[PDB]
Amino acid sequence: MKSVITTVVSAADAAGRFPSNSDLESIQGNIQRSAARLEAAEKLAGNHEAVVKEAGDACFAKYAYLKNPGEAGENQEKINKCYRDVDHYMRLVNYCLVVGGTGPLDEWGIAGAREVYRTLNLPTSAYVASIAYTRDRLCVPRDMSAQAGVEFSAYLDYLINALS
Amino acid sequence: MKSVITTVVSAADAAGRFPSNSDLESIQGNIQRSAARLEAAEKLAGNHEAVVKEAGDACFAKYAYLKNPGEAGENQEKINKCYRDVDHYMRLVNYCLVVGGTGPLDEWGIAGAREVYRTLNLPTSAYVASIAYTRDRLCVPRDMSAQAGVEFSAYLDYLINALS
Amino acid sequence: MLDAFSRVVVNSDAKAAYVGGSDLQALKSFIADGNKRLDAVNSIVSNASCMVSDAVSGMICENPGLISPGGNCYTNRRMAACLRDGEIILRYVSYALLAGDASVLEDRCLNGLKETYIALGVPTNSSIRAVSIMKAQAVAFITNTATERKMSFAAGDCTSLASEVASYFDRVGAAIS
Amino acid sequence: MLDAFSRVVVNSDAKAAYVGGSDLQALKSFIADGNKRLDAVNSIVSNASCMVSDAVSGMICENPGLISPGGNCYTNRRMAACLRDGEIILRYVSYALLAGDASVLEDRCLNGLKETYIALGVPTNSSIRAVSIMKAQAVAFITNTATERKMSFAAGDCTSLASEVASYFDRVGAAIS
Amino acid sequence: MLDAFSRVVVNSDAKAAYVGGSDLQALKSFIADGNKRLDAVNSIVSNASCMVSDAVSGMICENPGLISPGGNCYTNRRMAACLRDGEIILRYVSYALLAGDASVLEDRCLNGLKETYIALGVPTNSSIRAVSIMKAQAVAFITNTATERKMSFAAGDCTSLASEVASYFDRVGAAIS
Amino acid sequence: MLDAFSRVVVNSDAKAAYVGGSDLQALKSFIADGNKRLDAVNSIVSNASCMVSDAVSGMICENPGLISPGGNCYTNRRMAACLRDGEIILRYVSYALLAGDASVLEDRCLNGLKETYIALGVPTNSSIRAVSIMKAQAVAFITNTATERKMSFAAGDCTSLASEVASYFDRVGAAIS
Amino acid sequence: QTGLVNSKFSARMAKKTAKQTKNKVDEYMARSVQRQYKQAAVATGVYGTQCTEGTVKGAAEASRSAALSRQFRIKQRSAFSKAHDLFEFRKHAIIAAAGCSYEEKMVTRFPKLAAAMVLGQTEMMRTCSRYVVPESVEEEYMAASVDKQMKRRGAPGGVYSLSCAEGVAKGQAEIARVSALGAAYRAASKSASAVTAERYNSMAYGRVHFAHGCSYEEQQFNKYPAAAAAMRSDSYGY
Amino acid sequence: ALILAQNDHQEKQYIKYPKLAAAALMASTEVTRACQRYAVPESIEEEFLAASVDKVNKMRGTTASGVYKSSCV
Numbered sequence A, B: 001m002k003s004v005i006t007t008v009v010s011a012a013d014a015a016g017r018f019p020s021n022s023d024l025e026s027i028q029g030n031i032q033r034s035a036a037r038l039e040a041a042e043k044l045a046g047n048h049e050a051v052v053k054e055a056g057d058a059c060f061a062k063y064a065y066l067k068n069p070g071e072a073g074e075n076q077e078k079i080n081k082c083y084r085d086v087d088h089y090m091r092l093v094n095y096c097l098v099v100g101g102t103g104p105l106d107e108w109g110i111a112g113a114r115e116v117y118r119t120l121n122l123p124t125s126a127y128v129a130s131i132a133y134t135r136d137r138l139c140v141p142r143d144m145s146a147q148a149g150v151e152f153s154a155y156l157d158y159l160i161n162a163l164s
Numbered sequence C, D, E, F: 001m002l003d004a005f006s007r008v009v010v011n012s013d014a015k016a017a018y019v020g021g022s023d024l025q026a027l028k029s030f031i032a033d034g035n036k037r038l039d040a041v042n043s044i045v046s047n048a049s050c051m052v053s054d055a056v057s058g059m060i061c062e063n064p065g066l067i068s069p070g071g072n073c074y075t076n077r078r079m080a081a082c083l084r085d086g087e088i089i090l091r092y093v094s095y096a097l098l099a100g101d102a103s104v105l106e107d108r109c110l111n112g113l114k115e116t117y118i119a120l121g122v123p124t125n126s127s128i129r130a131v132s133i134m135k136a137q138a139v140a141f142i143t144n145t146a147t148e149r150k151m152s153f154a155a156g157d158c159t160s161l162a163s164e165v166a167s168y169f170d171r172v173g174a175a176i177s
Numbered sequence G: 001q002t003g004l005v006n007s008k009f010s011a012r013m014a015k016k017t018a019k020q021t022k023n024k025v026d027e028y029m030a031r032s033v034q035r036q037y038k039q040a041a042v043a044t045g046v047y048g049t050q051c052t053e054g055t056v057k058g059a060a061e062a063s064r065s066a067a068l069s070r071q072f073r074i075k076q077r078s079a080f081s082k083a084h085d086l087f088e089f090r091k092h093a094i095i096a097a098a099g100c101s102y103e104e105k106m107v108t109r110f111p112k113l114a115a116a117m118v119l120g121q122t123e124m125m126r127t128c129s130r131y132v133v134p135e136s137v138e139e140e141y142m143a144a145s146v147d148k149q150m151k152r153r154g155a156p157g158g159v160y161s162l163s164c165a166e167g168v169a170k171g172q173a174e175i176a177r178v179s180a181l182g183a184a185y186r187a188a189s190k191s192a193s194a195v196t197a198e199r200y201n202s203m204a205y206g207r208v209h210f211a212h213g214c215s216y217e218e219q220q221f222n223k224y225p226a227a228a229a230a231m232r233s234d235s236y237g238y
Numbered sequence H: 001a002l003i004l005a006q007n008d009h010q011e012k013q014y015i016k017y018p019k020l021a022a023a024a025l026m027a028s029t030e031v032t033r034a035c036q037r038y039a040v041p042e043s044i045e046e047e048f049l050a051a052s053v054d055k056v057n058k059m060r061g062t063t064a065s066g067v068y069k070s071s072c073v
């Protein structure tokens, strides 16, 4: 995982040095910002079945061509496999809010994604509409706090920038 | 130089990756504890000439054999160079009170110092008595504030840990 | 590398003076808006992969000679390399915007890149335009006047940091010219 | 590798659940003792040069058989490597205290080390007496109960941080003996 | 300078042999069709002014990004400096066709034309198209196969001089790339 | 060279747009605040000979190794050249402040100045100090805080022009580094 | 006189210019770094076990004439392949010269210094692909999997480059067999103190040069350091 | 010589005496070695850039008809 903690230990291991006050002050950033990045942690974990349902069809609302045969949305268990993938992703976005960095998204969702989606005929532009619909439907004082809405959206468009 | 910024900008450049939300979070640690070491800086800069008058003779307090003929501190102008020598090291720890790392130490104060003192016969085991005298000469509500003293002492015994 | 903190250190190292209370008020004001530096550079990195598609295709649709046969953006290996260094320059400008000084720019990116584009036959006159479109895009995302995406920031002034990135893309544009 | 914040991720990924109110009491407490934790690492970075010499000469005062000819401290080359690797495992446990987990020990210190030490002629009885004596030197710095050097700190109980490093040293002293 | 009569005489001077009638068979054949070659060079020079307008405006209509801003034929100074070197290449291959050897071409016009076009930023891929249309205009004027203006000539084959002038234009092309 | 008016024209020529109403705001305030620019240059060029002697006497008293036997400011043949290049830079910075663009500075002086001062043996780390003293005088004379001479000025603010000349001496400082 | 393009008779400007002196300083740091990186091999007065040329009297001189033809093929590279060799050796040396800004400063100027350090720093802590013999076929098939992907830029589009080539003359490549077969045995018959210094430095080499905070690539490198020492730069086509 | 003379006495001397202004150009291009006979191009692409204007400079060494003038011999 790549987090705030995991970077400075690898930087000190590269130099062959003890954790000095440059590495010590990086975890000070996990004191003021972890009050806001963990404010949006349980809002996703306590409402994970609501965000998957009315953003997973927003994939299919923009791309309704998948219901024709030969495509990926051609039968119901493929759609039942389709809602699992954005439920996998928002679990990983919740996994990167509680870790501080972008580790669990990188180690488990993005690495190797560009090789599977091309051979299995899965459009990554159809992935990115379900991700980006949760970004602009997010209200800043209603869904979460003000600084948590900046924080949760910043991990969200990293995945948009990962797939495109 | 090693700083809070210059570690994570060099760590993200190792993979060729953008500044992630982990990397902005480490900069947030370099704001709140930056002001702790900042008021230790100009208080040291306003009183630097009086520390070396007490840290200069402290190396000749417990090692009075330096002024013997046959060693490298025998005449008066070498003692004036010895007073100049510790003022460079108290200028270097004033610099890491600004940058928050060990950047102006490990390339300007330690790198090569193990070999110029072994070749010009200046005892490093007696030289560290000058810096470590200033470590316990620290009145944490009278010198400066409290949280400056937990890092200014940490830079000084890092320099004890670097030469020996 | 160095940053804006270590820039006044190596300037004071040349005179061997302690940095007192007089010159640190440039850096006392710098840590006062340290949230503003993170609130500006987060707008760039969130739209980083979409800024280089906005700029390279803006370079093609203004100068269509690169997609002529034989040209510099004709072989599909070559367009992959042109989009490869679109996000390298955008990485290294956002490195310098985060650090506050451009000292990471002319040693790891701009060092030798002028003679590299000359020796590769890269047309540098249209390569200024791919940088200058990123200059007009990074100044739009920071002051939040980007006319397809607005973000949520606290109100205030960020023209001091709008010109911080506008002096960095023009540092790229003056070194490879 | 892992850490403390990544341990509750892979504990939640072991069943593919989320991280909600059940697993967060260990992690919302972790930021509260973070200023205890950052003051614990600052205590151990201050004094690493003598506490390896406290350990590798305390190994001598109970076992002089390595300065006996044919031992492992007879050579000045070998006595550097006992001092060089006396602090690397001290550097790795200070990595583990900053990480909140001993994940960096079972790949960078523990794994390979038993197969290393058979191929060197390493006395395995010297391994356990070196780490357990500097275990008591480690918690004396953490609980500020070092009887020839004191330090200024903020008041409060700290035996939870003393027990966390006490769970690290018996890991590495077990398999290589 | 080495012409066709003097190309062979430095080949014999590499071994210091008297040039004899076994070696004049290439030369007496060359002097026999010399009225055809003077009928060949005159067909180029008498149409030499529009032939560079036939080629450089052929380069613009194939690739319209040269007159685009950022193109290297954009401004009115640069199109004048391209039509100036449109006719230097046609002047220096009429110097090699009249001399029967391309050793007036490889040293008085292209000894250093590769690094000149590199260091100026002149695109190499479009200067091939500037000279290859003049390759196809030479062989239409040598063979009298111009579809808009045919010149009056004595009858007979002229296919060797069309192959020779096309073997001069590729040496322009293989060096500036 | 180019100036401040021609900088936004060649920026509007690469896109081939007309000079509109949004890019002319940088120029139509450059006129009204340009009456202070003539008051900024006239404070510098009136004190021009005594500024370049203030710097190199500060360079000798800070770096006394230049007046060593064999040093790089030893003879009067060499000290006349160091007072020459001290005022070539102040001549070209006073062209850059007067025009408002740095274009005239870094094509007649700074292009090739780095490898010149390598090839002469001019020390870089003391000529950085020599131009930085001239940086400190120009930011004193423009806002009239020069502590042994005040000059007559209308009341107002000139920290825009004080930062512009501070952005020009480190362009010399980035060149010779 | 005028220039050589019109009516002259001998080549001029035979003078040490700026680019020749820039090549001359960079060749001299290449003879200093390769001096200093050989100091760890020959640290005592004797030559070590791995500073050997060959075994056959005709094979020790064939090591130089191969390597003199190997350094011509780096000079014979294309302009795109020289520039990709230029910046990738810049990147792998900042990872090498890690904690110093001064050591980072020198490599950004001098370009043959970058090739000299990262070839020698691979051979100072012996993270080369020749010096490691894996203990079993478990570690060998991990080591044989990674270098075939490193051989996958010897043929970039299925046609071979010059950098992977080892035969330059008639009967040349058979000496290139037996020099590495003897190098494989001397790495296997190396000292027991050195080979466990090899595996720990190579697993510390791969975690900073190629993993970059990846938990999976660090886990296979800590399990198989023989595959970590087979990982090299991609500027080397072989 | 009118645009290298400093004061107006020097540009008055260059006007009345036209043989003086010819050797005034021969004064300034020998105290500052800006001749072709001191020109050393540092590289091959600057050697060719020198020869781009020598062929223009030899074009005034012949007349407009094509006969070689007496100035270049």
Ligand SMILES: *C(=C)C1=C(C)[C@@H](Cc2[nH]c(/C=C3N=C(/C=C4\NC(=O)[C@H](C)[C@H]4CC)C(C)=C\3CCC(=O)O)c(CCC(=O)O)c2C)NC1=O
Binding pocket: C047, C050, C051, C053, C054, C055, C057, C058, C059, C061, C062, C132, C133, C136, C137, C140, C141, C145, C146, C147, C148, C149
């Ligand atoms: C073709 C001739 C042509 C284009 C293609 C297009 C490119 C272009 N766009 C701008 C201005 C902006 N570009 C932006 C980039 C994007 N817009 C987005 O919202 C996403 C993140 C991204 C695309 C994926 C942005 C943000 C701006 C600022 C305005 C805004 O709010 O959108 C320019 C610059 C124009 C100039 O230099 O004045 C160009 C060239 N324009 C074309 O003409």
Ligand SMILES: *[C@@H](C)C1=C(C)C(=O)N[C@H]1Cc1[nH]c(/C=C2\N=C(C[C@H]3NC(=O)C(CC)=C3C)C(C)=C2CCC(=O)O)c(CCC(=O)O)c1C
Binding pocket: G151, G154, G164, G165, G166, G167, G173, G174, G175, G176, G177, G178, G179, G180, G181, G238
């Ligand atoms: C480039 C790095 C290569 C790849 C990929 C590969 O599979 N082999 C490399 C190039 C190559 N070489 C040959 C032919 C020979 N190669 C030889 C070298 C082997 N001998 C050794 O001592 C070692 C070190 C372990 C090796 C690899 C030898 C010998 C030959 C035969 C030469 C001869 O007998 O004349 C080939 C196959 C092409 C062919 O014509 O055989 C390739 C791809």
Ligand SMILES: *[C@@H](C)[C@H]1/C(=C/C2=NC(=C\c3[nH]c(C[C@H]4NC(=O)C(C=C)=C4C)c(C)c3CCC(=O)O)/C(CCC(=O)O)=C2C)NC(=O)[C@@H]1C
Binding pocket: A033, A147, A150, B021, B024, B025, B026, B028, C032, C033, C035, C036, C038, C039, C040, C042, C142, C143, C144, C153, C154, C155, C156, C157, C158, C161
């Ligand atoms: C100009 C570029 C913008 C703008 C910027 C402002 N941002 C302000 C405050 C602010 N921003 C953040 C988030 C920032 N801090 C972090 O630690 C990280 C990431 C790890 C980020 C992105 C914070 C925490 C704050 C402080 C207030 C808050 O809690 O939200 C700000 C107010 C000044 C200040 O208080 O610092 C401004 C003006 N605002 C604009 O209008 C333009 C578009």
Ligand SMILES: *[C@H](C)[C@H]1/C(=C/C2=NC(=C\c3[nH]c(C[C@H]4NC(=O)C(C=C)=C4C)c(C)c3CCC(=O)O)/C(CCC(=O)O)=C2C)NC(=O)[C@@H]1C
Binding pocket: A024, A025, A026, A027, A028, B033, B147, B150, B151, D032, D033, D034, D035, D036, D037, D038, D039, D040, D042, D141, D142, D143, D144, D153, D154, D155, D156, D157, D158, D161
């Ligand atoms: C037990 C192992 C120790 C001990 C630990 C405590 N430390 C406490 C507070 C504390 N320490 C620091 C500085 C530290 N935090 C940082 O972010 C950085 C560097 C960037 C460092 C060095 C701070 C800022 C604080 C908070 C209070 C303050 O502002 O000073 C502490 C108090 C409890 C708590 O704050 O949670 C304890 C118990 N104290 C001991 O006596 C033993 C030796």
Ligand SMILES: *[C@H](C)[C@H]1/C(=C/C2=NC(=C\c3[nH]c(C[C@H]4NC(=O)C(C=C)=C4C)c(C)c3CCC(=O)O)/C(CCC(=O)O)=C2C)NC(=O)[C@@H]1C
Binding pocket: C056, C066, C072, C073, C077, C078, C079, C081, C082, C083, C084, C085, C086, C088, C089, C108, C109, C113, C116, C120, C122, C123, C126, C127, C130, G080, G083, G084, G087
């Ligand atoms: C794209 C907007 C440009 C353009 C780009 C091309 N670049 C080509 C190769 C190339 N690009 C870079 C830049 C970049 N890579 C780095 O590592 C660093 C600094 C650390 C930078 C700035 C380099 C170094 C290279 C050479 C190595 C390589 O080939 O990868 C390239 C390919 C040329 C070819 O295939 O012959 C192109 C097309 N060209 C354009 O038309 C626009 C202006």
Ligand SMILES: *[C@H](C)[C@H]1/C(=C/C2=NC(=C\c3[nH]c(C[C@H]4NC(=O)C(C=C)=C4C)c(C)c3CCC(=O)O)/C(CCC(=O)O)=C2C)NC(=O)[C@@H]1C
Binding pocket: E056, E072, E073, E077, E078, E079, E081, E082, E083, E084, E085, E086, E088, E108, E109, E113, E116, E120, E122, E123, E126, E127, E130, H048, H049, H051, H052, H053, H055
């Ligand atoms: C037009 C079809 C080309 C092109 C031409 C340009 N050439 C420019 C300058 C230039 N051209 C030459 C060629 C030629 N002139 C000679 O005197 C000789 C040898 C005796 C040759 C082969 C030379 C040497 C030079 C440099 C010297 C000069 O200024 O004339 C030029 C001007 C560039 C500018 O003003 O920045 C242009 C546009 N460029 C093209 O894009 C097409 C392919």
Ligand SMILES: *[C@H](C)[C@H]1/C(=C/C2=NC(=C\c3[nH]c(C[C@H]4NC(=O)C(C=C)=C4C)c(C)c3CCC(=O)O)/C(CCC(=O)O)=C2C)NC(=O)[C@@H]1C
Binding pocket: F056, F066, F072, F073, F077, F078, F079, F081, F082, F083, F084, F085, F086, F088, F089, F108, F109, F113, F116, F120, F122, F123, F126, F127, F130
């Ligand atoms: C003084 C601040 C320096 C220093 C100066 C020396 N420069 C020497 C020769 C020299 N300097 C320049 C720079 C300047 N003159 C120009 O005409 C222009 C641009 C129009 C500039 C920027 C040049 C070009 C030259 C070469 C010409 C010449 O021969 O004078 C010099 C003489 C070296 C010697 O005689 O051995 C000195 C001492 N050197 C220093 O140490 C301080 C830092």
Ligand SMILES: C=CC1=C(C)[C@@H](Cc2[nH]c(/C=C3N=C(/C=C4\NC(=O)[C@H](C)[C@H]4CC)C(C)=C\3CCC(=O)O)c(CCC(=O)O)c2C)NC1=O
Binding pocket: A106, A107, A110, A111, A112, G142, G145, G146, G149, G211, G213, G214, G215, G216, G217, G220, G221, G227
């Ligand atoms: C034998 C053991 C063995 C390994 C340890 C890896 C190591 C490895 N990775 C890559 C190749 C790669 N490695 C990564 C790295 C990662 N990808 C991710 O999803 C993570 C974020 C990160 C791991 C931490 C990426 C993104 C590429 C493709 C781009 C590249 O060539 O670097 C390559 C080049 C050839 C290839 O593509 O396979 C190799 C050898 N591969 C192996 O065969």
Ligand SMILES: C=CC1=C(C)[C@@H](Cc2[nH]c(/C=C3N=C(/C=C4\NC(=O)[C@H](C)[C@H]4CC)C(C)=C\3CCC(=O)O)c(CCC(=O)O)c2C)NC1=O
Binding pocket: A043, A044, A047, A050, A051, A054, A137, A138, A139, A140, A142, A143, A144
């Ligand atoms: C973790 C993130 C997080 C959230 C996304 C919300 C959870 C949430 N609230 C709504 C539901 C809603 N959200 C809004 C809010 C808005 N609608 C607008 O048109 C305005 C732009 C904006 C106010 C700022 C409204 C008005 C509803 C009810 C209508 C609806 O969308 O069904 C929806 C979609 C419909 C539904 O299932 O109910 C979701 C997932 N709470 C959270 O904790």
Ligand SMILES: C=CC1=C(C)[C@@H](Cc2[nH]c(/C=C3N=C(/C=C4\NC(=O)[C@H](C)[C@H]4CC)C(C)=C\3CCC(=O)O)c(CCC(=O)O)c2C)NC1=O
Binding pocket: D047, D049, D050, D051, D053, D054, D055, D057, D058, D059, D060, D061, D062, D133, D136, D137, D140, D141, D145, D146, D147, D148, D149
């Ligand atoms: C055989 C020879 C021999 C020695 C060399 C010493 C070494 C030594 N020191 C300690 C015990 C210790 N050693 C240290 C280390 C240090 N103490 C300090 O105050 C400094 C900071 C630092 C020296 C640089 C510390 C902190 C303790 C814990 C007790 C304390 O000092 O307060 C112990 C463990 C005692 C035990 O549990 O039995 C030993 C063996 N004692 C010996 O018998």
Ligand SMILES: C=CC1=C(C)[C@@H](Cc2[nH]c(/C=C3N=C(/C=C4\NC(=O)[C@H](C)[C@H]4CC)C(C)=C\3CCC(=O)O)c(CCC(=O)O)c2C)NC1=O
Binding pocket: E047, E049, E050, E051, E053, E054, E055, E057, E058, E060, E061, E062, E133, E136, E137, E140, E141, E145, E146, E147, E148, E149
């Ligand atoms: C977009 C703009 C554009 C051009 C400028 C031309 C450029 C051009 N000309 C020719 C081909 C030619 N070009 C010429 C040149 C000339 N012809 C004459 O009669 C004159 C003597 C002289 C101009 C003064 C000649 C002689 C040929 C051979 C065919 C012919 O005209 O008989 C060819 C190859 C065959 C062809 O497609 O025609 C091309 C691409 N074509 C274009 O598409």
Ligand SMILES: C=CC1=C(C)[C@@H](Cc2[nH]c(/C=C3N=C(/C=C4\NC(=O)[C@H](C)[C@H]4CC)C(C)=C\3CCC(=O)O)c(CCC(=O)O)c2C)NC1=O
Binding pocket: C015, F047, F050, F051, F054, F055, F057, F058, F059, F060, F061, F062, F133, F136, F137, F140, F141, F145, F146, F147, F148, F149
């Ligand atoms: C050891 C030798 C030595 C010196 C000679 C002085 C030289 C000197 N003066 C200034 C600093 C300055 N120097 C000048 C220059 C001048 N003042 C004027 O009014 C005149 C025009 C001109 C002298 C003829 C000015 C204007 C300043 C700014 C402050 C001021 O004088 O008001 C500086 C930069 C700041 C500093 O580093 O202290 C230096 C090095 N200082 C030294 O350490």
Ligand SMILES: C=CC1=C(C)[C@@H](Cc2[nH]c(/C=C3N=C(/C=C4\NC(=O)[C@H](C)[C@H]4CC)C(C)=C\3CCC(=O)O)c(CCC(=O)O)c2C)NC1=O
Binding pocket: B106, B107, B111, B112, G029, G032, G033, G036, G037, G040, G097, G098, G099, G100, G101, G102, G103, G104, G106, G113, G117
């Ligand atoms: C031609 C240019 C050139 C360089 C750039 C340097 C780079 C360099 N330094 C060292 C060797 C060294 N380099 C350093 C320097 C440092 N180590 C640190 O921990 C600090 C962060 C840093 C100071 C900035 C030290 C202390 C050694 C000796 C021990 C070691 O290798 O770490 C070596 C190996 C030789 C040896 O083992 O001694 C090399 C190639 N040397 C050169 O010849």
Ligand SMILES: C=CC1=C(C)[C@@H](Cc2[nH]c(/C=C3N=C(/C=C4\NC(=O)[C@H](C)[C@H]4CC)C(C)=C\3CCC(=O)O)c(CCC(=O)O)c2C)NC1=O
Binding pocket: G034, G037, G038, G041, G050, G051, G052, G053, G063, G067, G070, G119, G120, G121, G122, G123, G124, G127, G128, G129, G130, G131, G179, G180, G183, G232, G236
């Ligand atoms: C620092 C001290 C230092 C040394 C002791 C010598 C090490 C050295 N290198 C080579 C010879 C070589 N060494 C390499 C280098 C490598 N080959 C690879 O596969 C890796 C990518 C890379 C590091 C292991 C290459 C490519 C050759 C030439 C071909 C070869 O014989 O392997 C030889 C000749 C014997 C042989 O290998 O056949 C020796 C003694 N060079 C040094 O610089």
